[PDB]
Design a protein around this ligand. Structure first.
Ligand SMILES: *[C@@H](C)[C@H]1/C(=C/c2[nH]c(/C=C3N=C(/C=C4\NC(=O)C(CC)=C4C)C(C)=C\3CCC(=O)O)c(CCC(=O)O)c2C)NC(=O)[C@@H]1C
Ligand SMILES: *[C@@H](C)[C@H]1/C(=C/c2[nH]c(/C=C3N=C(/C=C4\NC(=O)C(CC)=C4C)C(C)=C\3CCC(=O)O)c(CCC(=O)O)c2C)NC(=O)[C@@H]1C
Ligand SMILES: *[C@@H](C)[C@H]1/C(=C/c2[nH]c(/C=C3N=C(/C=C4\NC(=O)C(CC)=C4C)C(C)=C\3CCC(=O)O)c(CCC(=O)O)c2C)NC(=O)[C@@H]1C
Ligand SMILES: *[C@H](C)[C@H]1/C(=C/c2[nH]c(/C=C3N=C(/C=C4\NC(=O)C(CC)=C4C)C(C)=C\3CCC(=O)O)c(CCC(=O)O)c2C)NC(=O)[C@@H]1C
Ligand SMILES: *[C@H](C)[C@H]1/C(=C/c2[nH]c(/C=C3N=C(/C=C4\NC(=O)C(CC)=C4C)C(C)=C\3CCC(=O)O)c(CCC(=O)O)c2C)NC(=O)[C@@H]1C
Ligand SMILES: *[C@H](C)[C@H]1/C(=C/c2[nH]c(/C=C3N=C(/C=C4\NC(=O)C(CC)=C4C)C(C)=C\3CCC(=O)O)c(CCC(=O)O)c2C)NC(=O)[C@@H]1C
Ligand SMILES: *[C@H](C)[C@H]1/C(=C/c2[nH]c(/C=C3N=C(/C=C4\NC(=O)C(CC)=C4C)C(C)=C\3CCC(=O)O)c(CCC(=O)O)c2C)NC(=O)[C@@H]1C
Ligand SMILES: *[C@H](C)[C@H]1/C(=C/c2[nH]c(/C=C3N=C(/C=C4\NC(=O)C(CC)=C4C)C(C)=C\3CCC(=O)O)c(CCC(=O)O)c2C)NC(=O)[C@@H]1C
Ligand SMILES: *[C@H](C)[C@H]1/C(=C/c2[nH]c(/C=C3N=C(/C=C4\NC(=O)C(CC)=C4C)C(C)=C\3CCC(=O)O)c(CCC(=O)O)c2C)NC(=O)[C@@H]1C
Ligand SMILES: *[C@H](C)[C@H]1/C(=C/c2[nH]c(/C=C3N=C(/C=C4\NC(=O)C(CC)=C4C)C(C)=C\3CCC(=O)O)c(CCC(=O)O)c2C)NC(=O)[C@@H]1C
Lengths: 75, 216, 162, 172, 172, 162, 162, 162, 172, 162
């Protein structure tokens, strides 16, 4: 489709944890393609940062809405 | 909607407000409005002192490191929230407060008390908080980027008992959840157990009989 | 409020758990500390009038304009002097509570929460109180664990003011 | 929330009537006083911190029981909350002056406030005294003849006094 | 919620008893009426908009105070809310017909509705009149002999009339 | 309601701020506008019966089937004609409220919110009311600021219907 | 309770929808099943005493320690045997409710919810009840749709226990 | 897409549950209906041109102004008549999908969602399409279960438009 | 999510065409096999716990590294998460069998599952081996000739094997 | 940034609304004000050095200890005096931005947000800057609307510090 993607190589994948990264202090970055099939959708491509404890719940949320997961990595 | 009785019931200010949304590429003022909106909603309009502010969570929210929902989850799991609403309350009162703060509505049925009481007892407070925020109801109303707000108006999936119980938990604009006549007592323990409701008593100022409360 | 016993039960209660060896260890830490804290509270209480009066005079010496300048926020008259000695007494008394409770809880609840708004609204300099707290640190005469815990609360208040 | 214009409109709509010529003329007179209204809002706002702090100092001087240990204004948190209350009430009084209608005060500031003070044990009579002190200072500030185009502001001053009286009555 | 089958089950478990032969036979008779029950739900649903709009028109004609200025059905917001309420009540009546139990209607719709309308100032008696008008239209629709296998639906129609009566009684 | 004064206060309240020079400018904008709005409201009111009757006939001329077709939603009888004139009167009356208020608030709260549900439920064509509104725009005889503000509300209603 | 009819309304209500052909088809599915379920409930009820005692003896045969070992959780005495026959009767009775209801609702709400904590708390092996349920499956004598639906509920309980 | 099979799985998935007898009954309900629905789709498809043309003429007869009035939203020229015949074809075609799918899902996702904004934006009267759907109801010539399911979807569209 | 019916509908709508006689006949053949489809779903579901546990035991027997200390399935929570994942995959395979379309499995289970396991360090090749073990057990259960009307279930068995194959390929 | 135009659009955007007569009135209010603000900004800019130096000396005169007491937070050396003149220059310069912008946005974003932390951290007294701001009010020499708007921002800063 003649487009680019963000670069998450080396340490560029890292994101700040603080006290918001759950019990394991790990963040997961979910890149998705989404549309409006609920709240208004503002962007066709979105990123979500969720802790390990909420990673399962987030996948079902993305799944229930019919949105596509393009990449998941540790942040 | 609520038009004629809106001011009498304390709903008129919320009729005049719009959901607070954090758009992509948000500005500085956008982040501040979210933080103010989250603190007012999630902490039940209690005054928040500078020493009590979650400066780290505010920083991550401002930076885009956490979304609005994750900021709400961080506030709800904080020691500030637990001090205000957990450590000094019956868990049914805690469940009442969680529904108002995080879902903007009152509990509908005893089944909700059963679910969240067991979830807290088996998995702990943090697990219970996740259940509200990761719920389908939270997803459909607020999603990732909108601060929770009171849902006074009728929506799909509502029950009428929810409307009457909202004014058991909401007691006016110039008021906080920790500054109501019933104080720490559960407002809906009896109503949920018996599946009963009570006549709506509006807030003080606009209603002379605002203080009516039944006895044991 | 933040004390070892309250924090221990607050953690277990948040987790919906019985108390475990972790919480029992917290209690043992409290017991190791408690007697020294009670000794410090007694020593500060018996010496409170001298510490408060000396602390107020130390502030006046370091900031002589406070006793020379007219204004509701200054101690040029007996009214302001009485307010000042009252405030320093509040710090000293609430510090003794921290020693009894074994934590900053009393300071957090009774004094520090909202102190910034008070000092701004009434045009009170936090530097004045920092000087008073430093005087109490240098003059309470405690030693050992009593000194360490007492100075931790005095420095805790100083840091909150700075 | 209504302003001075929408208050009349709401009453007209509930009757299904056009505003009469008398009602439109009355609103025209309100517009003629608009500059005085804006000035009064500006003057109270520009002195808001002084009005709050001076009134608070006077209230605690006359009611030392509020600030002694065990008093409802004792401890920094309660004291700060008390100062916030005075500022909030003053802020909403300026809103009512700006809109020309008490609804913003009734709908938001005074909605549930008595329940709040009864539940917390805040002495409502003492809040009313503090609000009265702010009223006295605010009206003097609005009426100051210096540095402004001279004219009669009695009508706007009377209106502002009413909003203060409303707030004081709502709490005690 | 309960349906016709689970209502009997719940009463049996509370007694710790197996369903009796008479109870099982009674539920078999309910099964034998299932097609008529499904047709009744289909017919009401297929005419839902006409039932609501005709009933609303008849109501406002008989009670013109509702739609005059100041009336509770006046303005588009309130009229829209009013029409929505009629559709909601009809929707839950069909739910109860589908399940053969009033619990879904009572639990989710009627419980608290009297208190809601009293709080909002909605005239509950007028809602009952509107519900009654929906009842007559719906029952006529259910009873229409055209384009359907002929038989006796008096029992189903009586059951549906009962649910409408529950709704009318609850609002007022 | 959406009016300059109420929205100015509600926005400031949401931010927890006193009114500042921004909100004062909003008030000055309102004061610059109000007299023309009140004058426009007076002119529409004095001419309301002519405008309503003229607007109704304009609709009937443009859509003759509405006066010849039997049905509850049409104006083939005096019942329907009376309903139609009443409705157009509501549009005109609420537009005068917008001029008095200086904003779309009266139209939003009394008429626009839920109008789509009404027209769908009762099978009323929005195009009918668009024609009535255009007639009123062409015949209210206003000029200057009065014309511009009045037409903005009339166009606001037209846009909502389209 | 989870049944086809309650599930149909629950889904429609959550969507704010009138019942459509989808929910009507759900009703027709229930009607197709209902008579076979009621016959199965009758057959199990009439044969219940033989099934319960036979199942209990099957458990005792497979786990002879249950009838030889002293303890509150075992069936070495008449007390424990009565508890055991009672529990097996509960399983069978609630299964008949499922056949009446046409869904796992009665099992979900009366038996399955909380069974894990009970078995852990009172030291009851889920394997005991699995064997009892297997005996009932092999001995209820049903056929056709009655057999298939009943075995689905018995298997549902077995799966919950394993 | 709302159908008995997808709704059954969606409900189970939302509960984190395997499919139980409740959902198998839903499938049996679908299988009872499916052949009648497939028959209905074939009959409507074979008669589609006659139904669309007859439905279009029914609208023009009921609303003669749509064939005499100039405007992009009317059928006074061949352009608008082709637009109208196309639209009615869309309704009939998507109704046959509902019969194939056994639910309103194809109508919900392809036609109903957004129809209100389209009709308002392009000044199309919902009453036009209601007449077209009523003609198809009166002329598809189905009977039995095929008729009842087909009429449910046609009535579903009519209700959505009113 | 699509089922066997809506899959054909969606393709037809994209071309703006009615379903052809051949397509309708194909769906009629699908309807004729529906009872076998329901039996296959019922049999897999009725043995779900056994299928998962037997597959898990077999997997750890051939891949003991998974359960040795430091292995990805070592510790109770990781083992529980692994058994959970196996049950999830089996559940969504039954969903696909029930609907006759793989969309539910692909959209709601396999969507991003390969990347999730990579990010977590879960060995996907071992997940695939476990899924294959569930596959062979499930197909024998579906194919069991005892206690069922006799007939040819080869087509449904092939379809179910396809869904298991999709799950195994997606993870690894 | 709080300015009349930015708040008008942001409120409309939050409502998903085109701009209406309300927002246009806000624009007219800005236009009535804008020239006075620009001239006020010019007058303050041209006189900036005299105002800043005069303001700094007003602070030193009112608080002589700031020029007599050693310390990083005081102005007993040229280093401290240069910091103080710099800070007062920041206040004046950002005030001219508010006059240009027509609101407190520049003060809020550049100066007021976080000022409490800075003054607390660096032991700077808000009363010093209040005195500097009061001098600027007393000496900028503006009149009419320019005076009123300029003083609103200077008083806004004073209130923020008090
Ligand atoms: C491959 C899957 C195996 C197989 C299946 C098979 N089944 C039938 C027929 C039927 N199966 C059912 C199923 C049920 N009835 C119920 O009440 C329930 C419980 C909710 C279920 C699951 C039904 C209704 C039938 C029809 C009546 C009958 O028993 O025959 C067939 C026959 C063909 C058909 O499609 O009807 C087949 C082939 N048979 C095998 O040999 C495989 C091992
Ligand atoms: C009172 C309600 C009226 C009435 C009803 C009635 N219906 C039947 C029989 C059937 N009705 C249906 C219904 C449907 N078939 C479908 O495919 C669908 C669409 C999803 C529906 C709603 C069916 C399946 C039957 C059975 C077969 C048949 O066509 O007859 C009866 C006959 C008795 C029975 O219970 O079967 C009756 C009485 N009849 C009236 O006269 C009332 C006005
Ligand atoms: C009672 C309130 C006091 C009083 C007020 C008063 N003001 C005016 C006139 C004006 N005041 C303003 C105000 C402002 N101009 C600005 O640019 C801003 C800052 C954003 C403000 C607040 C204006 C614009 C006018 C009109 C022009 C003028 O300068 O005169 C009057 C005169 C009557 C009138 O309504 O115009 C009065 C009476 N006067 C007193 O004596 C009271 C103490
Ligand atoms: C119409 C015949 C009459 C009428 C109705 C009317 N109702 C309201 C407002 C509300 N109606 C409800 C009711 C429900 N909400 C639910 O969720 C359900 C159960 C699922 C029911 C039955 C509620 C809660 C409200 C308030 C909240 C909201 O409207 O969203 C109004 C508007 C009231 C107002 O605007 O103040 C009206 C007009 N009024 C009449 O005069 C008719 C007799
Ligand atoms: C056991 C000895 C007796 C008994 C108990 C019983 N309790 C309930 C239900 C509830 N129990 C509670 C209790 C608490 N909630 C809290 O927040 C706290 C402190 C943290 C406590 C102790 C609540 C709120 C409920 C309601 C929700 C729930 O059902 O779990 C039941 C169930 C009653 C019912 O389902 O209707 C039972 C059985 N019952 C006996 O017979 C024993 C004497
Ligand atoms: C002493 C170092 C200097 C000083 C003091 C001074 N303080 C005030 C006024 C107040 N002091 C406080 C502080 C507290 N109140 C509490 O409850 C507690 C926590 C338990 C504290 C620390 C408060 C709240 C006030 C305001 C209300 C009151 O007056 O009680 C004043 C008077 C200020 C005024 O304007 O009235 C003074 C003089 N001033 C100096 O110059 C000393 C160096
Ligand atoms: C000061 C003159 C008096 C005084 C006040 C006091 N108030 C509180 C607590 C609260 N005040 C409010 C009021 C509002 N909150 C709002 O949002 C609004 C505007 C819409 C108003 C008017 C509320 C809600 C509270 C409770 C929330 C909170 O966090 O405090 C206190 C604190 C009491 C306590 O126990 O902490 C105090 C001290 N007290 C006096 O003695 C004076 C007479
Ligand atoms: C006139 C252009 C055409 C026309 C009108 C017509 N309208 C109705 C019915 C209603 N009109 C309204 C509209 C409003 N009610 C309000 O409260 C407001 C907001 C303040 C508006 C705009 C409503 C709600 C109705 C329905 C209820 C009622 O009758 O009041 C009718 C009758 C419809 C019916 O079925 O009874 C008619 C005839 N019809 C034409 O043909 C004209 C071209
Ligand atoms: C010993 C008291 C009795 C006994 C044991 C037994 N256990 C298994 C299998 C497993 N045991 C575990 C337990 C753990 N795995 C862990 O990682 C940890 C936490 C660090 C624990 C406690 C697990 C997970 C299994 C299954 C997987 C595996 O095989 O490792 C078996 C075999 C069960 C089977 O079906 O293969 C046995 C025999 N059995 C007795 O009879 C003893 C009295
Ligand atoms: C078992 C055969 C293998 C294995 C599994 C394993 N998985 C995890 C963790 C997760 N698995 C998932 C997958 C899903 N979650 C869902 O909700 C669904 C459907 C939408 C799927 C497919 C997820 C999201 C996680 C992480 C979050 C969570 O566990 O809730 C683990 C634990 C990993 C860890 O402890 O960090 C394990 C052990 N591991 C093996 O070695 C086997 C080959």
């Amino acid at each position: 489709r003649n487009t680019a993607s963000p670069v998450y190589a080396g340490s560029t994948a890292e994101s700040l944890r603080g006290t918001s990264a759950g019990s394991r202090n790990q963040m997961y970055r979910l890149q998705v393609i989404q549309g409006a099939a609920g709240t208004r959708v503002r962007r066709g491509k979105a990123e979500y940062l969720v802790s390990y404890d909420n990673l399962s719940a987030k996948l079902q949320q993305i799944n229930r809405q019919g949105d596509t997961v393009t990449m998941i990595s540790l942040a | 909607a609520i038009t004629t009785a809106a001011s009498r019931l304390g709903v008129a200010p919320y009729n005049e407000s719009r959901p607070v949304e954090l758009r992509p590429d948000f500005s500085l003022d956008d982040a501040k409005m979210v933080i103010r909106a989250v603190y007012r909603q999630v902490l039940g309009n209690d005054y928040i002192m500078d020493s009590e502010r979650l400066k780290g969570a505010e920083s991550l929210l401002t930076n885009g490191s956490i979304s609005v929902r994750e900021f709400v989850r961080t506030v709800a799991k904080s020691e500030l929230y637990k001090k205000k609403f957990l450590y000094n309350n019956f868990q049914t009162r805690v469940i009442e407060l969680n529904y108002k703060h995080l879902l903007g509505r009152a509990p509908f049925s005893e089944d909700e008390v059963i679910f969240h009481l067991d979830l807290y007892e088996n998995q702990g407070f943090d697990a219970d908080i996740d259940s509200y925020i990761d719920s389908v109801e939270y997803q459909e109303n607020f999603g990732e980027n909108i601060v929770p707000y009171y849902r006074f108006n009728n929506q799909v999936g509502d029950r009428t008992v929810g409307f009457t119980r909202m004014f058991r938990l909401y007691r006016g604009y110039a008021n906080s959840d920790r500054s109501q006549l019933e104080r720490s007592s559960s407002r809906l323990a009896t109503e949920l157990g018996q599946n009963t409701v009570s006549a709506i008593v509006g807030p003080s100022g606009s209603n002379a009989g605002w203080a009516y409360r039944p006895s044991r | 409020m933040k004390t070892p016993l309250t924090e221990a039960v607050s953690t277990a209660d948040s987790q919906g758990r019985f108390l475990s060896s972790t919480e029992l260890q917290i209690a043992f830490g409290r017991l190791r500390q408690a007697n020294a804290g009670l000794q410090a509270a007694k020593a500060l209480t018996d010496n409170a009038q001298s510490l408060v009066n000396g602390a107020a005079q130390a502030v006046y010496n370091k900031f002589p304009y406070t006793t020379q300048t007219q204004g509701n926020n200054f101690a040029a008259d007996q009214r302001g002097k009485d307010k000042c000695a009252r405030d320093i007494g509040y710090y000293l008394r609430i510090v003794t509570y921290c020693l009894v409770a074994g934590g900053t809880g009393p300071l957090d609840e009774y004094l520090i929460a909202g102190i910034d708004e008070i000092n701004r609204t009434f045009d009170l300099s936090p530097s004045w109180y920092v000087e008073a707290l430093k005087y109490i640190k240098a003059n309470h005469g405690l030693s050992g664990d009593a000194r360490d815990e007492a100075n931790s609360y005095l420095d805790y208040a100083i840091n909150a003011l700075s | 929330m209504f302003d001075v214009f929408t208050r009349v409109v709401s009453q007209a709509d509930a009757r299904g009537e056009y505003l009469s010529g008398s009602q439109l003329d009355a609103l025209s007179a309100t517009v003629a006083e608009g500059n005085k209204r804006i000035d009064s809002v500006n003057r109270i706002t520009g002195n808001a911190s002084a009005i709050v702090s001076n009134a608070a100092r006077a209230l605690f001087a006359e009611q030392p029981q509020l600030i002694q240990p065990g008093g409802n204004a004792y401890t920094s948190r309660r004291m700060a909350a008390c100062l916030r209350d005075m500022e909030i009430i003053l802020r909403y009084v300026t809103y009512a002056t700006f809109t020309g209608d008490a609804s913003v005060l009734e709908d938001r500031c005074l909605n549930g406030l008595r329940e709040t003070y009864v539940a917390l044990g805040v002495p409502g009579a003492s809040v009313a005294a503090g609000v009265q002190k702010m009223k006295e200072a605010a009206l003097d500030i609005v009426n100051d003849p210096n540095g402004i185009t001279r004219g009669d502001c009695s009508a706007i001053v009377a209106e502002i006094a009413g909003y203060f009286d409303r707030a004081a009555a709502a709490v005690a």
